[PDB]
Structure formats: structure tokens, C-alpha cells
């Protein structure tokens, strides 16, 4: 099915994920329908690090999109921050 | 088949194949009766044949053996032919 | 294998394939077989 998931586009030992809306069957870093935001676990305490277009996610969910567990967690975190 | 799953699938497939063939074959036979009737020029007979077979076809479609569209098509063609006949 | 196929790389000692002399010689022989003095011959003929 269509899924919202982290696509690990970064350096070695320094992950950076794009929260992409991909068909589950497609590869992790490979094909996707839309890029919805990003997340950086390294990041550090400065300004930014996690950022997701929530509206788009919601739309996708409505349509029928499976959010990854990690992605879900991230979303939750974002919500709490808000 | 190196993997257990493949082996299972293979035997299952064989079993499945045997099953489907029987049903599909039967359906075909049924169809032919209608077609045969049409060829002959016996309208009532043709109708009877259609009645006998249509439900079976529908059932098959439901099951998955034959596609719904395909099932519809046979009926349409058959229906057309019978109409033409009388 | 069923066919005989020695490489010419085996003869070359720098790769480190054959330390023995005899083995190397044997290997060489094969190539010559595959392939399939004059003055001396001439002299002999003359004689």
C-alpha cells in the first residue's frame, strides 16, 4: 500500500531522513510519490532538526496511507512540540 | 524448488491448477452447448443452455477462476447471438 | 574440468602460481603441443 516513511538520504554515521510518501513496494531511498518533509536524528540543539508537512500527511492518511512506526512517533513528537 | 515455500507453492499450484481446469473446462463445455444450439438453429434449446450455464459462469467469476468482465462478455455475446436467432 | 585449459599466467612466476620448475615445464609443454637447428640439418644432409 501507499506509505509515509523515512528515506535515509545522508552520509555515513550521519543519517538524514526525508519523510516521503512512497508505495510500500518501492525502495526506501528510491521512488516516491511526494516528499512531505524531513527528519534529522543527529541535528543537535540549535534551531531545527525535525519538520513535516502535516496537512499533506493527513490528506494521504485520509486517502489510505500507512504511516511508518518511526514516522508515527515523529509525528506525535511534532504534535507535542506544537 | 530450493525453498520449502516454493515447494509448497508448487504442489499447491499443481493442486490449484487441477481444480481450476475442471471448473473452467466445465464452464467451456456449458458455453459450447449454448453455442452448439445457436449453430443448430434451436432457440428454446439455446435459451435453456444459457440458463443452465450463466449461473455457473457467474459462480466461477465470483470464485476468481474467470474474471468478472470475462464472465460478462460471454453472457453479452451469448445474449446477442440468442437475440439474433430469435 | 573435462577439457584441458592451462593459462599462460601460470608460467609467469611473478603472480605466484607455480614455484616448481618441473610443473612450469609441463605447463609449457602443453602450449607447444597445441602449437604443433636448420644449419645442423643441412650439414647432416650434406654428410
Amino acid at each position: 500500500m501507499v506509505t509515509i516513511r523515512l528515506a535515509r538520504h545522508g552520509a555515513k554515521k550521519r543519517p538524514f531522513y526525508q519523510v516521503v510518501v512512497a508505495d510500500s513496494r518501492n525502495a526506501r531511498n528510491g521512488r516516491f510519490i511526494e516528499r512531505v518533509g524531513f527528519f534529522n536524528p543527529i541535528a543537535s540543539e540549535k534551531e531545527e532538526g525535525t519538520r513535516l508537512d502535516l496537512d499533506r500527511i493527513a490528506h494521504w492518511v485520509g486517502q489510505g496511507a500507512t504511516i511508518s512506526d518511526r514516522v508515527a512517533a515523529l509525528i506525535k513528537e511534532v504534535n507535542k512540540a506544537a | 524448488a530450493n525453498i520449502k515455500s516454493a515447494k509448497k507453492r508448487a504442489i499447491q499450484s499443481e493442486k490449484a491448477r487441477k481444480h481450476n481446469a475442471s471448473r473452467r473446462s466445465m464452464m467451456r463445455t456449458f458455453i459450447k452447448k449454448v453455442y452448439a444450439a445457436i449453430e443448430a438453429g434451436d432457440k428454446a434449446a439455446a435459451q435453456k443452455a444459457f440458463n443452465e450455464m450463466q449461473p455457473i459462469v457467474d459462480r466461477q467469476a465470483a470464485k476468481g477462476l474467470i474474471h468478472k468482465n470475462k464472465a460478462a462478455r460471454h453472457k453479452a455475446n451469448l445474449t446477442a447471438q440468442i437475440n439474433k436467432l430469435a | 574440468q573435462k577439457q584441458p585449459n592451462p593459462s599462460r599466467d601460470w608460467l609467469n612466476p611473478n603472480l605466484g602460481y607455480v614455484t616448481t620448475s618441473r610443473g612450469r615445464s609441463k605447463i609449457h609443454a602443453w602450449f607447444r603441443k597445441q602449437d604443433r637447428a636448420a644449419i645442423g640439418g643441412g650439414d647432416i644432409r650434406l654428410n
Binding site: - | - | 599462460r8 608460467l11 609467469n12 611473478n14
Partner: protein, 62 residues
């Protein structure tokens, strides 16, 4: 194809393997290649201290 043995002297002979690199010797009509000295069978040139890289000559300890 015919190839040029660079440097002074060699251990080359009939039925012996070598590495060829191209780059013609222009005054020889036919030769379009050079033997790399120090590669595979062909030994590097004996007793040279400048442009050693071009003639496969290992670095003398001093």
C-alpha cells in the same frame, strides 16, 4: 604488433610475456607501442637514478 623496449638493456627473448602501453617511437616506421619496464616479466632498467618511474627502477637505499 611491434613494440619498443625503452631504456638501456633488457632480459627480453622469444616466447616471453610483457606489458605494452602505447605511445609511438616516431622514427621507426611501424612501431606504435612501448614495453613498460618493471611490469610482469620485463625487469626494470639496471642502474638509473632519474626518471626511474619510466624504467621500473626500484629506489636505491642510501
Amino acid at each position: 604488433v611491434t613494440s619498443y623496449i625503452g631504456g638501456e638493456g633488457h632480459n627480453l627473448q622469444e616466447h616471453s610475456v610483457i606489458l605494452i602501453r602505447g605511445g609511438r617511437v616516431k622514427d621507426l616506421p611501424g612501431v606504435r607501442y612501448h614495453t613498460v619496464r618493471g611490469a610482469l616479466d620485463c625487469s626494470g632498467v639496471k642502474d638509473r637514478k632519474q626518471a626511474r618511474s619510466k624504467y621500473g627502477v626500484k629506489r636505491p637505499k642510501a
